[model samples]
Target: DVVWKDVDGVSMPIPPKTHPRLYLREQQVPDLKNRMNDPKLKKVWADMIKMQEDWKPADIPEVKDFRFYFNQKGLTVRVELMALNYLMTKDPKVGREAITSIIDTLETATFKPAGDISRGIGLFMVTGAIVYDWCYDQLKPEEKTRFVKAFVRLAKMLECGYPPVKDKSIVGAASEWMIMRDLLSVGIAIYDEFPEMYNLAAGRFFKEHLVARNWFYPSHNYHQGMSALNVRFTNDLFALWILDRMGAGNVFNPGQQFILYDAIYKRRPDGQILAGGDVDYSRKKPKYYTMPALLAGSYYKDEYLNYEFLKDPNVEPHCKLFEFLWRDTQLGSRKPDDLPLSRYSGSPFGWMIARTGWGPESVIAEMKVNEYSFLNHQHQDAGAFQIYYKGPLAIDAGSYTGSSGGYNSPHNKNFFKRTIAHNSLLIYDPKETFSSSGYGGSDHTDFAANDGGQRLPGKGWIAPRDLKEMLAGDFRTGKILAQGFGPDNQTPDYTYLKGDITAAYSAKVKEVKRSFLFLNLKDAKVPAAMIVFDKVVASNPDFKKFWLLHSIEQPEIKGNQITIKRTKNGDSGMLVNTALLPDAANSNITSIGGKGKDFWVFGTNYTNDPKPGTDEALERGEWRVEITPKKAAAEDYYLNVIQIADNTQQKLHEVKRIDGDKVVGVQLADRIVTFSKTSETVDRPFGFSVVGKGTFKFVMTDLLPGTWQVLKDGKILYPALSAKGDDGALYFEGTEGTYRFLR
Candidate 1:
């Protein structure tokens, strides 16, 4: 028996039976037309008026053109523009043409029923519903039945609902919001004629899909990878808007509003977003970012969200009507300048972006340290971080081979989504199976590239019924221990993040914790410095562990120190890495990159061979460096001091390793940060010389709890906890944390 009614069942409010009820009420048309003359919307209205006057059907697409969903899109929106234009201008010709467009398309046969409804018959229904509802007075007696039967045929294909009517295993893909969007539109457009359609449409959503998806959105912030998040929001947001106009309950969710900031930060200074999974912008860069900011901005009257909308200059043709309708000119806009220099997302699939400033030349860094969203667009780049100064220094490094068959293709699953392709830690487990994954398909089962990373096999979607349990467990992925700005979170001198990514890998990884400490200098030449420390423990001493960093430029390696430089449009920036590996003599550093070998994983190169070179490739970086230990060890640590500067800089900060009997760390600039090297001794103590007369900072995360005796320059004296009379102060953290202040 089908479970139609659940505890979440709530009757959605239906508006009075009226034409043009989806986006607008008939009574409000006069007011809407009067408000269209407002100064702010003058250009927008003019553009719409001009488009209707000069619009032609020459660009009308054949049904076969849509081999895949949204292949040659814009048909539904084109119908919307003409229909809405007809409504506002009282032009019957425009309205009839819109109706004729639908009738002519359905003159052949309605698309055959299939799984991807949006690409096939479902899209035909969206255009027809729009034409039928707005041009109701214009439809002939025979015409209305034609549209109704077509809707019934497609509704039967989907059973008039998503998982509610068809699949129930997981929530429907937000990308396929077209199904909900078009279904509801069909429900309302034909509500007076076919009342049964409205109940199935509204009942399916409220009873089944709504709660499951609402449970997901807040934790995820609708983060559907990089490319899809940037563009595909139009479908989902429009569907949500339709429900809002219908006064439907549970139409919006918590995470839906937060996507505004996620869109703002991930959009790099160069306009290309930081690549995550299946990002291909080969066609027109339809800046669909306007949808999120506009929807949330208008719904909440939020000025900050409005400001985000103001910054985007692109107004693509498909959504021009939406841009005209929801563009908020009355709200005061506020730039995110006073906000923290760095921000963290509540989304498990979201990224942590830290930047020095919003300017083009400022240094920006990002990392993915979250539980994997089990969508097809997701990649295996957990705990991967990238840095940018004037160019993409550290990179993601691959093309979207997903288009050629993501799950089944060896190049995509075997290489692009592998941990080796990202800037992360890798452990080589020789016996680990490249088998079928719980989340989706496993091309790795056939093409085994056991490069010592996390296996895709796990509890999958079956686990984690609760939020806390989901983020707490190790089976899903890693978790963030601590992350924030330093010297108080508001006005920060440094941005910091600590992640325990041990669980992101196989059982060979006993423990792995990584910390990023970025000091913002706010200088013209040198803007920031990053201190990266890795504490890794493997179960098997024989399984070699590797620390990976990707680059767009082939780096210059010198012993333990590596340098990366990039130049674009006569501006250049450089990154100098001072690596303090476990054993200098036994450690190895090698750079691999060229025309054909940079994307190398298992005996093959995955780089786009004849594609754009360094000058053209944005996020698909070209080079990388792998640092590994020559000798095997269960526990190993890597300390690195990375600085971003330009050619005008004379000298780089000398990174000195501070290794005591039980503590290990590095000293750079005015701060000394350390971690306990061993658990052998209780209350590990480390000492360092006081170098100038200014205030200095010290951070030690693993120095258990104890008293300390200090005698510096053979002339210094003071207990750390009690520093009286301008001697300074101490802020004792939790059990495993420490912070010392001295002047």
Candidate 2:
């Protein structure tokens, strides 16, 4: 079902050669011009300009506010860096003051930030680079000395937060912890340039933490990779600089060979890494979808990683980094091939954070691995990845009042420092998976997942895609091509044929590695789908979770046929069933002749998990379950339709078709169910229109003795209320028995 990359059925050997560099320069910015006018990009650009352009220095409150860096510091620092970078080149007249002001801000409470190893002080350290570089040519003698001292102090502070050993574990440490490799590079660069007071500090740090005769990338004994780079020896752009400054050789460092070489050339035959950890952690081996590839591309100067990273706007900075290196290398003077372009414009610092590090094709197949692995995250992030995308947009403008310091250090990795939460994919869910950020968890010194005795098995990455063709204007057509492992080998499933305007998509799982595809488009759209693969189903009992498909509009099921249509302005989404039922109920679900039960139950989260203090949390609710049953033997099959009634009693459309002795199909046709002109129908137009006012409910009997399985996705849950007997039919009775529709 799934097509594997042809590899002569054997893993290919890594070609031994120095990696080449790709530079991202001004001329390359317009490579996406063809897609520039793509409505998605157009809408995004307009929104981006409006949301970000008017931002200015005057926006930051001058008065001291403790919560100023509440998850906004990283972002702020990035922007400040960007502004400095931009001003240095285009408007040097205003650059000096800007750099000085940024330096002053850096000197404030944000710099010596509260300690949270996971979310390192990468942002703050990078900020120093930005300011320093911006004012490099313009600094006066005294100013230069003071500037150097500030950087020196900041670099010293950065070393204090290195991994393996966290400064001090704080409360809410999980939410605040972060690992910032770029920050480490900044410290390395600053220390390398000025061997003054920082010499002792830098030398001591490297001597103690640099692994195996300077062979492995340096790592703090404790919290290094969890929130930052995610492993011992995770390649940072500072390798050459660090070694050169220390008067050492890069001889012992396996560089990309140890981590990324196997990953790109061996482990991920599909060229994508499942989210997990590296050699550093204990319990979960955390891996990120985008970080590894970007790191690999910059580290080895590989074209594949570079191309994919740039093609995906999610890794915008890395793309620019690639272009910068590519152009500078050809230009001679500014070229530094031995150095990785993990940074932009030859600098390791920046003002913004790229939220999600994912590419479209990367997760099209679930990443499966037998080795212990994790989707690395620090503190409360556990091993979950941050999710952000180009076409799909979500704007959360809420604010929280909190303190500075702790794992999410206010100055270094705080809101301003770690700003750029804007483009991240981590809309954190409540489920906390095991993490390697701390020692107490499986990631500890003695009891981690990758420890001597711990047994780690296979894992995978599953992502949902939005097919453009399925939503194409008026006339649309396409299919979902899903790939992943199955009970045996990897399998691909081609599931639905969506046509112009599919409201939502979702899925549930019985195991990892199962695959499928979904397609959709509207006439004004092209046939496209959100394709994903390499689904690593959690094997541990604690790893149980459900995948959901949601939308604003409520999807309408015509009789037994569940229509895959686009959502209206305000309807909830849909969830695909994942479990396999007993043979009894398997024959009567979505597809009439399907083997296992493939029933489609529709409802919003309020009706699913209604408690309170949650997203889409409701008191209690009800939902309708419908399916077409395959005729096993004449009157032996049946479809039990349960629903809340409305004001009208109109006739609902129904159809039945049979292939010889087998009941081939049953569906809802265009026939309208006209209800009595009750008090409700008098004021509104009935069903079939986007904003049709009235309501109607009906049930088609003549069901054989078939069975049904009602699915319960975490969000849209139907409580188990009644089951007359062991016949295969189940009903989830919620706190409330009915849902009312008010026009």
Candidate 3:
């Protein structure tokens, strides 16, 4: 049903269309002219010219070069430069020659439709559409007909309007927004010429594709590839909105507006999106969607949106592209500086992002726990947490772009998609598949049907032919158990996220619960510390478990205490000191992925490889922390504390599980913060230096009922429900939470 061959077996996939002549006008597009003159954009224009001058017709017929990175490979060079060159130089003769070359070569070139529409046609169509729009007034009748027919023919061949399977499929609408984006662009460009195709492409996109049920997968939650895709569509919708303002029908969706706004609000203080599932977190790079933020801010006249754009200096370069659109828009005449920092919990998606403040030294923590999006680009890391202190302390290993340059290549199975590669607990098994092995071997049908009963004959890896199939069939069992960011910073200055990721693994694991506690301290040097507690209940007595923490820094290990140092541009931000105190488990530090040269490193973290025979380091690295339970038991508990130290006084001494593991105590330089569920009323003494030396009493009464009182220097001090005190101390009194005394 999906063949593209003829009767004689000599395939003719390239449809026939003819543009006999080219028409040119003398007027220049002012924006294009200015960009050509700008020194910052000079390299792009030069690159385009070099590509045009060195091009050959034979290269145009091959689909491989036109597949991934088509724009970068110069497949769209002729038309793109045709538009820019004409507008820059205003020479009709050269522009006509360039235009003729583009149509002539594409008309004769043979294009067997490749894997999917995004790979085969989306890239080239955008290039053609832009040329058609810019040169509309200049094109001859025959030229217009050829370009218009090509779009219609290509759209029909790809079956553009047929919606991709929504729930358990991945052809049309359910495809990532990157794939869906070009369809919308094509429809928008040819709206007047071909309204049927336009409605098919654009109408279904809004009506069926853009809804929360279709695009918003809970587990992915704007991470993985979702953030970039959403940003691209945000710009696409804004572009269509421009057409709407120019007297087209209403093409804007209020739901889409909220989607973009939520993404904008979750942006890191450094202006980068929260990199979780399939992002290049080790690279520490920003994305290319800042322009849309400016456009949305300008269109909506929202001050917060404008502030998000103007606060970061890196966004300055992207501003030139939208200068005309934002020329008269009010930008950050007022700022939201005095407003207290906050946390946003997108419940349906199970995403919580918390920040201490908007200052340069603020702390940001992100937690992800929700249902799997069933997109292979989304990893199986449901309860993963990423922290930003000075820079990223704990991080995701990043998207695995395979050695073959395909997303679903064999390499990803071993590193990126495996549960062992994430910051969560893995139920260990030596006889069964190793933790480092790739997920969903070939014979996926047998494996999923039998619940991993029929293992592959050998370790031979079979990369999934299509990621969508593997995602839908093999890795579709995970679900979110419970998640929330307790309260805002005003209440307790903390965030707690708990997730049950039992289904993410095989049936060997019966129950697994992971909890995250983030404490934002006003007086601490690093301003925050994180506590990760995990409880696992396995059905098999021989089933052991391992807790993993992935970091981009090489660790400094001493006993059960590990410290990670993060440095960028000659400045060190936060020093993460963590301890696996007094536990029955064993811990080790190792590198999971391949060595530096063999691994895929993004260019943005942009650092030279370390000198040979030296201890020098690159800006990019991945280090794994593995903590294994000492013995196989039905119930196991693991406790870890991460203290953010700024190379200053380390107040915390050690944490010990005293009194049969019921009372957990944090020993500091001069005081102890203790937790006891057994005792109803116990006074825990803690020392703090607020203005001078002082001894404080913290009492937790009726632990289950949840009431706490504090005494500073032997006087009863009514603790505010919130953490708003002169000494920068607050007591949290959840039904079963804790209390703290400072100064």
Candidate 4:
């Protein structure tokens, strides 16, 4: 069943059945025996063999299976079950149970409306194969042609449609997986033990699933791997069975030789088996990692397998694919809980130990983190990492949908429907099944934008911020971190999950350690730097000075890496009110003074003053000249402009004037704008443009006109602006004896 839909996109026809040889030398047969000989290894092999033997049996009075998650597929289960049964009991107990389970599961099977390909195939093939294999057993029975009747009926259903109704396009991955399983059964002793099952599986795998000219299909790359594994194993088992059937002595004892070692070893390095191309299919690159190795164990063995497995000193740290399947092992053991060290200090997954649930941790540990998750022609998840920790510092209560299908597809530029692209907390969006459909249940551009390989304004939401705004720090002292990120039913109170799911959701912005502060509330645009006002009235809707502050600190802008360091005197309260000072409540002074804190303190009066004298009008005076061009007619008016602030939680004011630069008509707006020491200044370039061919008369005066002097680098060059203004405009222009508006 290696053939699938062709480039024309229609299903291809199934090829005639032929067995390929995967042989071992007469001297290389002891590796499997040797590995199985150890006590622990023997136990694993025994448990696995038992599981494989009963894998397909559907019979039980009430069907009590501890592994309910795996109970969904009855046919594939039955194939393994039947093989295990025949391996011990030549009788038909396994086949009988398989028949009952297949029919029962199928008859009672319910198909929920969903776009997931895995679910559809998982249900259909398992059910259909049960009936088909039964027919194969009866092909040689003259007394029971009724078996073939069941086979033909099921064949029509699987080939052209589902049973009970006619729907042909159902043949996809699940159908193919089952098809391949049954085909492998054809040459295995199960077919001789029950010939009817072999015939049933034959046409299904080779014809209906693999080679059939069917409907739209997914890539055959993985399917090819599945086929190669099944075929190679079946051939190896068959070679041994054929010797027994013909009464030939077991001459196939190739010591230390494994099927994978013999077939793929030449093309593979010591520990790797390069899948995909060595076979007919050349779709994806080699499946050289752990899953291939784990799967190869079911059929082959090589000395290097054990050697490479132990190459890493810690067997526990190795990413053996079997770990995911095993109840005792964790997915990625690198971090123990699989979280980065920095964020792990406060992450939920970094702390607690609990039973596995379909939560965000699964998303963090197992979801695709490669180019596959990206948006491109063939965006495969190559390098993305998701993490979830449970507890007190909850990011958002994450959740998951109870289904699977969010992988990728080659059609329609699979947007939101794929597994790799969606808004998920730790889990994936459940509704994200149709990889090519571009539908999301409802996640924000923040999560989806990154998933789609686009940029976002910020890291949307985090616990530190949400703690203050939403929960109000009630749980801040406790050792807790939010574990999941799905949708929360609580409206004002939100929740999130941590697996791959698709559904409507909402995330909020609460903390403002590093947020955008808008100077113009009407036009709250983000700039490299923003001016923060001193006192922001929460009730005032028109407060343009209101800032969504990320965190307050002094920023040293060196090139692009702006490091906003904590103040020389550190901040202690987790969330403190910055508008008022610690001693303001007790001090006789009503105004809070600027202690050289570098930040924007809007709303006019920033510097502390027991009695306010217009508070060194930085807003109307210094900034106005800083942004004005020397030759600009606007400079003639001596208007006001705003800088982030000179340097303090309390905003400072400085005077702006076109100073004499000793050059021709060109004048420079010069001053260290810091204006901390009104008399202390530094000559620095100010933002302005100049015009005029000749020197013009300059004057020095205040906006509410008073005499002034100019200061350069902390030295008063002349008596600068000297009095307070009634209108609060500290203008620098045309005054007596101080200086002219130098041009």
RMSD of candidate 1 to the true fold? 6.1
- Position 743, candidate 4: lDDT: 11
* lDDT string, candidate 4, 1-743, tens digits: 22333322433332222211111211222333444355545454444444434334555324232223233333444453453343234356655555544444444444333343322433344334333333234223532243334433433433223231221111222232223332332223233334444344433333333332111111111212222443333333333322222233332333213333322221221122222111211112433323333333322343333332223312111111122222121112211122211111111111111112222211111121110111211122111122111211101101111011222211112222222222111111222222222222223122332121112111232111111131232211111211221111111011111111111111111111110111111111210111111111111222111111122222232221122222222211111112111112221211112332211122222121112332121111111000111221110111111222112223222222223331111122221111101111112221222333433222111122245445434345446444333211123322222222211
lDDT at position 607, candidate 4: 20
Worst lDDT 10-window in candidate 4: 619-628
Question: What TM-score would each prediction reach against the true structure?
Answer: 0.81, 0.32, 0.63, 0.28
lDDT of 2 at 151: 56
Cα lDDT tens digits, model 3, 459-507, are 2222232333444454333344433333354534456555555655556
Give one digit per residue, the lDDT tens place, for model 1 in 1-743. Answer: 11223323564656456677766667656766665778877776666555444324685434343343343244455666778778888688898888887676654555544445444556566667778888888888888888787777665555324333553312234235444566777887887787567677656555544544565567434544666664455555666777666545336575666666765665556665656666643222423466667777766677777887777734554445566665666778887767667776644543567788776776878766665544355566777777877777777767664223543555566667677888888888788765434333232343346667666533441223223343455435666655555555654566666667766777787888777767776656568777777887888988888888888778989988889888654437788888885658767988888766767774677645323332244346668888888888888887777888884576877777876545666666656665556422224345443343345465554433444544444443455553222111222222112222232
Model 4 regions lying over 4 Å from their true place: 1-144, 152-172, 183-292, 298-559, 562-743
How far off is residue 690 in model 1, in Å?
5.3
Query: Can you write out model 2's per-residue Cα lDDT over 1-743, one digit (the tens) per residue?
Result: 11112232322111111110011123333443433455534543343333333335677555423233323333434444344345324456455655656666555534333433223344454545545543445545666566566655554454333322332211112212122233333433343245333333323233332322232222111222222443333333333322322233332344332243222221221222322221111112323424444444544556554543343423233123222222111111211122211111000000011111123311111111111112122211111111112111111101111122222222112121111111111111123231223332222332112100111111211001111211222111111211111111111111111010011111111222211222111111111122211122222323222222211123244433332221221212222222121124444432211111111111111112212332221101112222322332211122111111111313322222211111111112211111111101122211111111233211111112233222222233322223222111121222211221111
Model 3 misplaced regions, further than 4 Å: 1-148, 156-181, 188-195, 213-221, 225-274, 281-288, 302-330, 333-342, 357-360, 398-406, 429-492, 524-526, 553-559, 567-622, 648-743
* Two-way lDDT contest, 2 vs 4, winner: 2
